[PDB]
């Protein structure tokens, strides 16, 4: 007798494993729909005896599987799982060296922006509400980051090799972060329209676009008003474990002890390369696999991260 059937497990979350008896005369596709083995699309291949007892990813095809997928990924986007697997097939071959005490990514497939994201996340006090992200994030911190990178790609709607952006990626990722108690209060004054207090929460409480300087947001920054004038606003109150300050790329000085980490961007509207700036015993520039220690830094910066707990203004009235 030749082996005609094998037992395997199918899953959408790598946690709930569903026993299957597989017919070796049919493709995985014919039995399960689109099917993946460690990210590789095996929809078109027939089973092998060596597949016995292995775990295969499938698409959610009934209410139970859809529920398991939503519970794990916190999205109902039907294309997500396939995009995640497509990315994973490539990110499993990336290398994740320890550089300046953090898990970085050797350069591959235009992944500089993702390396800068990964490096930043390891320094923020953040957690993810989506179990897929939180579990992968834990493993990434230790050097096992292939899965986390594939997820970031999928959550970002980026494919492997696609040119990316740190701020855009952070916007997508932070939608799944623990930011429900993040709060920002801004005092806004227009000379024509008058005064108002704006309260922002969640992602909008921690991301700002217009200045790299947390000090400037505290003391006053120009902001367009609906009337066509430039109004001024400053930070009254901040409750979050960090803030991310962004601005169109320009030369900026970074001083150890005055920020947590940052993204350098060498380039312009067309093209650019993203490197990570942090500090340990001195300033560190981490460009994939490559470290440069620095005693000072003035360079082209687009995003600066700062630690926070709770801040209240000392500006009166």
Residues engaged in binding Na ion (CB under 5 A): 115-116, 120, 132, 135-136, 208, 218, 234-235, 243, 263, 276, 286, 288, 313
The reply on whether position 192 binds Zn ion by CB under 5 A is: yes
Which residue, among 175, 95, 93, 162, has the nearest Cα to 133 in the 3D structure? Answer: 175
| Smallest distance, Zn ion to C-beta of residue 230, A | 9
Helix (H, G, I), strand (E, B) or coil at 181: coil
149 is in an annotated binding site: no
- The site partner of 191 among Zn ion, Na ion, none (C-beta below 5 to 8 Å per kind) is none
Q: Is 286 exposed, middle or buried (CB count within 10 Å of its CB: 0-12, 13-18, 19+)?
A: buried
Q: What is the DSSP letter of 47?
A: P
- For this structure, is 273 an active site residue? yes
- The site partner of 170 among Na ion, Zn ion, none (C-beta below 5 to 8 Å per kind) is none
- The site partner of 213 among Na ion, Zn ion, none (C-beta below 5 to 8 Å per kind) is none
At residue 101, φ and ψ (nearest 5 deg) are 80, 10
261 is in an annotated binding site: no
Q: Round to whole Å and give the CA distance between 100 and 82.
A: 34
- The site partner of 193 among Zn ion, Na ion, none (C-beta below 5 to 8 Å per kind) is Zn ion
- For this structure, is 48 an active site residue? no
227 is in an annotated binding site: yes
Which one among 190, 206, 207, 304 touches Zn ion, defined by CB under 5 A? 190
Q: Which is nearer to Zn ion, 196 or 253 (CB)?
A: 196
Residues 122, 141 contacting (CB under 8 angstroms): yes
Cα dihedral sign for 106, 110, 113, 117? Answer: negative
- For this structure, is 230 an active site residue? no
Q: Round to whole Å and give the CA distance between 304 and 264.
A: 9
Residues 145, 96 contacting (CB under 8 angstroms): yes
Active-site annotation holder among 109, 112, 165, 176: 112
Which residue, among 304, 310, 243, 287, has the nearest Cα to 107 in the 3D structure? Answer: 287
- The contact mask relative to Zn ion for 227-246 (x = CB under 5 A, - = no) is x-x-----------------
Q: Output the CA–CA distances (angstroms, integers) from residue 236 to 65, 187, 200, 313, in the order listed.
A: 46, 6, 12, 5
The reply on whether position 225 binds Zn ion by CB under 5 A is: yes
Q: Which is nearer to Zn ion, 192 or 280 (CB)?
A: 192
- The site partner of 140 among Na ion, Zn ion, none (C-beta below 5 to 8 Å per kind) is none
Q: Which residues are annotated as a binding site?
A: 190, 193, 225, 227
Which residues contribute to the annotated binding site for Zn(2+)?
A: 190, 193, 225, 227
* Catalytic sites, residue numbers: 112, 273, 287
Q: Which residues bind Zn ion (CB under 5 A)?
A: 190, 192-193, 225, 227, 229
């Amino acid at each position: 007798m030749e082996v005609k059937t094998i037992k395997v497990f199918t899953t959408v979350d790598n946690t709930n494993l569903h026993t299957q008896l597989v017919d070796m005369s049919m493709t995985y596709g014919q039995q399960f729909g689109p099917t993946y083995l460690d990210g590789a699309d095996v929809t078109k291949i027939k089973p092998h005896v060596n597949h016995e007892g292995k775990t295969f990813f499938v698409l959610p095809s009934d209410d139970t599987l859809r529920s398991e997928a939503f519970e794990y990924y916190h999205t109902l986007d039907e294309s997500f799982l396939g995009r995640y697997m497509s990315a994973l097939n490539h990110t499993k071959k990336w290398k994740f060296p320890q550089v300046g005490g953090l898990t970085s990514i050797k350069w591959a497939d235009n992944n500089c922006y993702l390396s800068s994201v990964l490096l930043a996340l390891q320094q923020l006090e953040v957690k993810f509400n989506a179990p897929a992200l939180q579990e992968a994030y834990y493993r990434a911190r230790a050097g096992d980051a292939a899965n986390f990178c594939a997820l970031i790609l999928a959550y970002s709607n980026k494919t492997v090799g696609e040119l990316g952006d740190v701020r855009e990626t952070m916007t997508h990722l932070l939608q799944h972060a623990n930011l429900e108690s993040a709060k920002r209060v801004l005092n806004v004054v227009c000379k024509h329209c008058g005064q108002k207090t704006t309260t922002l929460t969640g992602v909008e409480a921690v991301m700002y676009m217009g200045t790299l300087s947390y000090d400037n947001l505290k003391t006053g920054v120009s902001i367009p008003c609906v009337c066509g004038r430039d109004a001024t606003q400053y930070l009254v109150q901040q409750e979050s474990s960090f803030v991310m300050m962004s601005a169109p790329p320009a030369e900026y000085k970074l001083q150890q002890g005055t920020f947590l980490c940052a993204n350098e961007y060498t380039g312009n509207y067309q093209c650019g390369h993203y490197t990570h700036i942090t500090a340990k015993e001195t300033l560190y520039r981490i460009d994939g696999a490559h470290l440069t220690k620095m005693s000072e830094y003035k360079g082209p910066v687009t995003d600066v991260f700062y630690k926070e707990t709770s801040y209240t203004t000392t500006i009166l009235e």
